[PDB]
Design a protein around this nucleic acid. Structure first.
Lengths: 50, 251, 125, 445, 282, 91
RNA sequence: UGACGGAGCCAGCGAGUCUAACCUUGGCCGAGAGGUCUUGGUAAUCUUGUGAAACUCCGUCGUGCUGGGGAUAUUCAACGAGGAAUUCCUAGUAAGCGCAAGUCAUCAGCUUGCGUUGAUUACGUCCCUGCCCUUUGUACACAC
RNA sequence: CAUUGGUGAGCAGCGAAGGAUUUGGUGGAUUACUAGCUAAUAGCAAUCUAUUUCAAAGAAUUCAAACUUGGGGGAAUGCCUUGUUGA
RNA sequence: GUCGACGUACUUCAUAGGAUCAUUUCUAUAGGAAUCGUCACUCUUUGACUCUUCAAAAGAGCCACUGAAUCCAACUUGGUUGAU
């Protein structure tokens, strides 16, 4: 892993770096809910659940 | 530069906006009656304003100072700034055209001859002439080097607008009647016209000086011809030996 | 949804991220205001991006700076660099380019280390 | 390699030791040392010219050395490279001193003031930054990427507004008074600025040929069809003979040689700009040729503090009344070429030095540059040399303490002395000596 | 030049892996070369492969300093930095002075607040070739590390019987002429590797009458380093001792610069193995 | 070995040296068709100058300078993915 | 440039189921091994992450050195920035400051890292002390 | 306590018989404007035909023509060139 | 410390029976099986076509006229005797 960090090549574009994002310290945010769900649900969904 | 636009209001105040973002940048308050002409240098360094109280203000533009203020003898109706030669012309109310440079702030020509209010005027693109048009149904051309009127056209409709092309190709006038734009071509783009005044040293009238053949009999003087004739004469053997082809042609 | 701009200011190991966006005019370093940035003798080192160009540039935008790393003087140099080049980048992107390079000219006439750090060193003689 | 322009011989050839290809050079003023930089080596190669050896390899850039220039006065080397860094090397005399100035983006075309005080670099952002050399801090920059005409190519599928192909200058050059910069790049605009005010003086469209590629910013939408544009269709087999039905263009070739071997239209670009050292012009190496742009004083009435009493009529009255100095300064305030020529020829030889000593100092570069551009082709050789002798004797200390004002008016004068007058003097000298031989010696049998 | 040097080291170790992988074809091409030379029959494995012989038609025209030093061996003079550990004592600063006087084309760099990554980067883009980092123990210098910079090797040594020229007497000034070298019984391939490392930090081609000499004499993995000047008499040659003497022992030799310690080790001292003290250049 | 001059010289080797394949091996695009689309859209410069056609052959020393143009949306989104985007230098 | 007494604050290294005292006083259980509880003394760069110190602020003092047996419920060792000489040193450098680690050699009577704060003076010269090089210009013009 | 995150409920402000977003089609520009057709010194354009035919001119031993082939090896039968036998 | 002889030890090398395919019929064998001018239906495989996801990127650009779709406001209708 240290060698891969030495050979990152910073001109590395993927299409998944639109959806995936990064916290303040620089590490990877992994959403602990789903990735087939949504974490925030809409107002009418909240109306039905409540 | 295209960055700045200048508004001159009828209460005498120049406001300077940015053309990209549309907001007020500066606001000069010199005049008290209506500001009828604003222009600026080709280097965005000195601006010149003229109001119909008859004062031309000269401001520095980068610093917001004024460099000076010059009081003319009539209310000024229109300014045109020739930007390469830094000479701007004012149509005064006393039916004269005051040509004044912005560097040293002097009246450098004053053109008289119009009988009614000057509707429009414009500089030649080389800045040698100024063509004006006025309510006496006339269009005049002034050679501001010599300061006199080169040509005059009595045109039946009063010409309300006069503009030169930014090359020396065309004059465009606009009259009181007629929905179009009248277009003239200057014949002095193809020939040379005499700067000799109309009313109602031929080389100096045609702006030339044919250089005389020798200035003094005790002065050495080369030939009137190409400079290379001496070298051609002195080395025409080796030049032709150079110029021969590398092998003999097949006859 | 808002016009916003992010810049970075660095000295030795301090680093400061400045987010500039349109707002009411509040300048906040690490949550606290800019008028609390210790060691209090270099508070004018932090202030000079504001006083060099006037507060009328900051009257319509709100800046926030997050500063980690470094020491006291490296953090005030990171703060002033982040504020300066963030104001320049905001006036580039959302205000006119004439005010952009007027700001660049003013900061560069004061010191261009407000905008470009001195980064890779030494010299092997 | 070095070329004698007398005997037409390549007398010197300098190679490195690493087999690299050189992209820019810079010579000493006192031409002991040549210097050259590559785009694949990150070093600068320093050769002596007297001997042929490799004197040094300067190292310290971490990117390909895009441009080199020696300061013409204090002889300090300035290199600038794609690691976003301009660097100043004190080579001569025990220093081995290096001063690196960082800059915002990667540099292509550094240029150097004629007095060696400042250096102007062009960057890939689109800017021209100007730095003080001795105190390595930026004096001022021009933001040039919005007065650049970048046309749209035929093959590309992105507009000329959003293109990043040519919105920067790959070649810049100082004027010889140090006050202006001409600049060109891979675009069809060349722009010149005045570096005190950092404002665009004028922009020149270097081509309107639609046969070149990057000329039009907006391409005619009639030519864009349901499958491709109609100008990317090769109609080369509709040709009358085989030698232009032939396609011998190997595929991914850009900037090789032999225009047949590239398959695209030739793009429009300026590869080098330079100002003229003697007369108020610049040359630009475009794709169409060496475009030479020059002013001329025959047109453009541009006076210098005339008043209402300053007139061609007034000037010839002062000439006829033979106030010769007043006629000369009236013609200078008119700044009219025919009037200056008329007064200049009407002043007699008896009082050239009185007039030339009483010329005011603001009209000195005007009379010097007039005498240069007149005397190159005028026949009055002794008259022009009398005027040059009177001006250099009467006011030749003002010239020496204001070098860069008369730096292009004095180079135009010694373009007249060594190029027509010295050739004539050589001919009369050879005639004198052949006479002395042909009558002084013994021809008997 | 970051990306160039990374991909250049990548291509070099790719080529080295490809050489050790396809080095069997070199020796079996050698077998069929000498089979053509003396007309002896060819083995079954080299006799039934048809592709190798129709490559041998092409390959019949095929045919000291090693891969890191081979490109610029005698072409270019070295450039050495000598630096101490960090916050050094005065006797280590005297020793670093003595080592920078030992090696010509060496300068000395003050060490303090220099991180070893950006120190290595500053050296290998300013164009230096070797770095000598010296470590002490209460004055007594205990280690020196030599790093050859265009991704070359680092040899780490300990120093053992150190007597210093600053410590002895005012015996005068040094010579600083390009010396002659002496290497005594460096016999193994590690011995030739250490010789090439230790001697490509001297200038190529001294004078034939260059009157100072410096010897690296191996005595059971303890390289005695002495430096002598000489003047040849009528009966022998008279040796005077000048400059520091020590014994260096190689304990590590790896294949990268100083910064990483992720480099592949070519050799390092197995101390606690069962047959440790039984062989030399172990 | 010189048998490379008959065996290993090959249109696929000259084609692996093309610009989109260099790109895809440098991880600069996820596939060769994506690399073709990106350098057709004018995102990729070698050195300073923008390269516009796919067939461009990239030598060994000239593949160190294959980057994106500045003011690229792709450069902006990779910098803002790692939120190292500094808007001072436009990306 | 101090001494007390509070307060604000700012790092970068470092993550092996691995990291860590000694000597006693006694009670109870047990066949014994021992277990568990209890107890005083000595030693200590603590223990894995949070945190540094120099620094900054706020109250208070007020600048002429050290000894044991004697004597009530004074006087007999060193030392207040270190002589002659001597060594090293040119920018994130000298120096101040703390914090971690402990990597097959070396080191814990310490060694190596890591950040924090950060200058003065040279940046010329061969005059002195030395060391080196050359003494046909060769290499192709021009010039010397 | 931050969201410089999504979804909503609302104010202030802006605010002329409404506002916003998206999209299909057509027309005009995207180079500098001398008119359509044909068998063209003129006809036609409502039509070329029942004059559209004759005459003249007009034919290189160039009776030569792949400047057009991915590399190595070969070419039974072809094909090319040269000679040859028989007519 | 070098190379020969002897001795020792080690490595490698066999290639036979039968079937099938390979000749625009026929691989040499009679022990084998195939010669038909289309009508329809069902199931299956594939490729385009349009739209789209991972998942973006770039828009042959401007202006006018005309049609459409959606979200608000406004009006109308149904609606706590019950809308969603």
């Amino acid at each position: 892993l240290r060698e891969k960090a030495k050979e990152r090549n910073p001109d590395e574009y993927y299409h998944a770096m639109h959806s995936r994002k990064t916290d303040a310290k620089g590490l990877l945010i992994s959403s602990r809910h789903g990735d087939e769900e949504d974490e925030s649900l809409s107002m009418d969904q909240v109306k039905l659940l409540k | 530069c295209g960055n700045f636009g200048f508004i001159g209001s009828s209460n005498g105040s120049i406001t300077i906006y940015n053309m990209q973002s549309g907001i007020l940048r500066k606001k000069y308050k010199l005049h008290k009656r209506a500001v009828t002409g604003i222009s600026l240098d080709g280097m965005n360094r000195k601006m010149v304003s003229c109001g119909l109280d008859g004062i031309v203000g000269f401001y520095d533009f980068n610093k917001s100072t004024l460099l000076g203020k010059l009081k003319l003898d009539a209310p000024i109706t229109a300014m045109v700034y020739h930007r390469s030669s830094d000479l701007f012309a004012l149509a005064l109310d006393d039916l004269s055209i005051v040509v004044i440079d912005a560097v040293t702030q002097r009246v450098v020509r004053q053109l008289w001859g119009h009988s009614n209010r000057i509707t429009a005027f414009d500089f030649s693109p080389e800045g040698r002439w100024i063509v004006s048009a006025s309510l006496d149904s006339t269009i005049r051309t002034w050679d501001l080097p010599t300061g006199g009127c080169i040509d005059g056209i009595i045109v039946d409709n009063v010409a309300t607008n006069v503009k030169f092309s930014p090359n020396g190709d065309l004059l465009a006038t606009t009259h009181v009647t007629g929905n179009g734009i009248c277009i003239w071509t200057n014949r002095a783009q193809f020939k040379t016209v005499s700067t000799r005044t109309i009313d109602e040293l031929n080389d100096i009238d045609f702006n030339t000086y044919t250089s005389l053949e020798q200035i003094d009999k005790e002065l050495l003087t080369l030939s009137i011809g190409p400079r290379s004739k001496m070298n051609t004469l002195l080395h025409l053997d080796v030049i032709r030996k150079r110029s021969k082809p590398k092998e003999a042609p097949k006859k | 949804a808002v016009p916003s701009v992010q810049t970075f200011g660095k000295k030795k190991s301090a680093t400061a991220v400045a987010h500039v966006k349109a707002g009411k005019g509040l300048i906040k370093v690490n949550g606290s205001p800019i008028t609390l940035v210790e060691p209090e003798i270099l508070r004018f080192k932090v202030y000079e991006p504001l006083l060099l160009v006037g507060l009328d540039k900051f009257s319509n935008i709100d800046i926030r700076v997050r500063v980690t790393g470094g020491g006291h003087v490296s953090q005030v140099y990171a703060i002033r660099q982040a504020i300066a080049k963030g104001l320049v980048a905001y006036h580039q992107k959302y205000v006119d380019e004439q005010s952009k390079n007027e700001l660049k000219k003013a900061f560069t006439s004061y010191d261009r280390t407000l905008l470009i750090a001195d980064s890779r060193r030494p010299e092997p003689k | 390699r070095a070329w004698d322009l007398i005997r037409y011989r390549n007398f010197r050839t300098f190679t490195g030791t690493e087999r690299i290809q050189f992209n820019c050079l810079a010579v000493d003023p006192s031409g002991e040392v040549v210097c050259a930089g590559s785009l694949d080596n990150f070093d600068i190669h320093v050769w002596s010219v007297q001997t042929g050896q490799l004197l040094d390899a300067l190292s310290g850039h971490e990117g390909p050395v895009s441009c080199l220039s020696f300061s013409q006065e204090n002889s300090v080397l300035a290199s600038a490279s794609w690691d976003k860094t301009i660097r100043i090397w004190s080579i001569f005399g025990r220093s081995q001193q290096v001063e690196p100035i960082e800059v915002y983006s990667d540099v292509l075309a550094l240029s150097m003031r004629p007095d060696g005080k400042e250096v102007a670099v062009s960057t890939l952002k689109g800017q021209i930054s100007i730095f003080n050399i001795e105190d390595a801090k930026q004096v001022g920059n021009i933001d040039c990427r919005k007065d650049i005409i970048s046309g749209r190519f035929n093959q590309d599928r992105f507009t000329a507004k959003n293109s990043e192909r040519s919105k920067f200058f790959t070649t810049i050059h100082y004027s010889f008074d140090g006050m202006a910069i001409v600049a060109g790049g891979n675009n069809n605009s060349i722009c010149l600025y005045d570096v005190p005010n950092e404002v665009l003086l004028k922009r020149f469209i270097v081509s309107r040929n639609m046969a070149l590629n990057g000329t039009l910013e907006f391409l005619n939408s009639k030519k864009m069809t349901e499958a491709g544009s109609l100008d990317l269709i090769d109609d080369a087999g509709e040709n009358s003979d085989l030698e232009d039905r032939i396609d011998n263009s190997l595929p991914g070739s850009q900037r090789g040689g032999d225009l047949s071997t590239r398959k695209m239209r030739p793009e429009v670009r300026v590869t080098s700009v330079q100002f003229s050292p003697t007369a108020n012009a610049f040359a630009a190496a475009s794709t169409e040729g060496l475009l030479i742009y020059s002013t001329n004083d025959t047109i453009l009435f541009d006076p210098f503090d005339l008043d209402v009493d300053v007139t061609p009529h007034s000037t010839v009255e002062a000439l006829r009344e033979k106030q010769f100095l007043n006629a000369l300064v009236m013609a200078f305030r008119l700044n009219e070429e025919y009037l200056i020529n008329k007064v200049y020829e009407a002043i007699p030889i008896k009082e050239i030095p009185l007039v030339a000593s009483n010329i005011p100092a603001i009209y000195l570069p005007r009379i010097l540059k007039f005498i240069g551009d007149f005397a190159i082709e005028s026949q009055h050789i002794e008259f022009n040399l009398i005027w040059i002798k009177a001006l250099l004797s009467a006011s030749g200390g003002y010239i020496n303490e204001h070098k860069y004002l008369f730096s292009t008016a004095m180079r135009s004068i010694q373009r007249f002395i060594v190029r027509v007058a010295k050739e004539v003097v050589n001919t009369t000298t050879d005639n004198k000596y052949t006479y002395r031989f042909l009558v002084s010696t013994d021809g008997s049998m | 030049m970051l990306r160039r040097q990374a991909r250049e080291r990548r291509e070099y170790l790719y080529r080295k892996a490809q050489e050790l992988q396809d080095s069997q074809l070199q020796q079996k091409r050698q077998i069929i070369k000498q089979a053509l030379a003396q007309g002896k029959p060819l083995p079954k494995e080299l006799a039934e492969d048809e592709s190798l012989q129709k490559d041998f038609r092409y390959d019949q025209s095929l045919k000291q300093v090693d891969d890191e030093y081979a490109a610029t061996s005698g072409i270019m003079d070295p450039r050495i930095i000598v630096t101490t550990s960090r916050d050094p004592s005065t006797r280590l600063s005297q020793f670093a002075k003595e080592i920078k006087l030992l090696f010509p084309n060496a300068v000395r760099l003050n060490r303090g607040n220099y991180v070893m990554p950006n120190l290595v980067d500053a050296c290998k883009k300013s164009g230096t070739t070797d770095l000598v980092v010296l470590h002490e123990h209460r004055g007594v210098p205990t280690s020196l590390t030599i790093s050859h910079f265009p991704h070359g090797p680092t040899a780490q040594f300990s120093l053992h019987n150190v007597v210093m020229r600053h410590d002895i007497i005012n015996a005068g000034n040094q010579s600083e002429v390009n010396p002659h070298l002496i290497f005594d019984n460096f016999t193994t391939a590690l011995g030739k590797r250490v010789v090439c490392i230790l001697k490509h930090l001297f200038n190529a081609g001294p004078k034939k009458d260059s009157e100072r000499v410096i010897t690296f004499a191996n005595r059971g993995d303890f390289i005695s380093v002495r430096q002598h000047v000489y003047v040849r008499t009528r009966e022998g040659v008279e040796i005077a001792e000048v400059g520091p003497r020590f014994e260096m022992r190689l304990f590590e030799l790896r294949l990268g610069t100083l910064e990483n310690k992720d480099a592949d080790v070519e050799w390092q001292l197995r101390r606690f193995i069962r047959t440790a003290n039984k062989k030399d250049y172990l | 070995k010189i048998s490379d001059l008959e065996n290993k010289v090959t249109v696929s080797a000259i084609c692996r040296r093309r610009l989109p394949v260099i790109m895809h091996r440098l991880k600069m695009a996820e596939t060769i068709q994506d690399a073709v689309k990106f350098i057709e859209q004018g995102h990729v410069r070698v050195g300073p100058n923008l390269i516009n056609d796919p067939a461009y052959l990239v030598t060994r020393n000239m593949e160190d300078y294959v980057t994106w143009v500045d003011n690229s949306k792709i450069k902006k989104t990779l910098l803002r993915y790692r939120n190292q985007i500094d808007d001072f230098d436009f990306s």
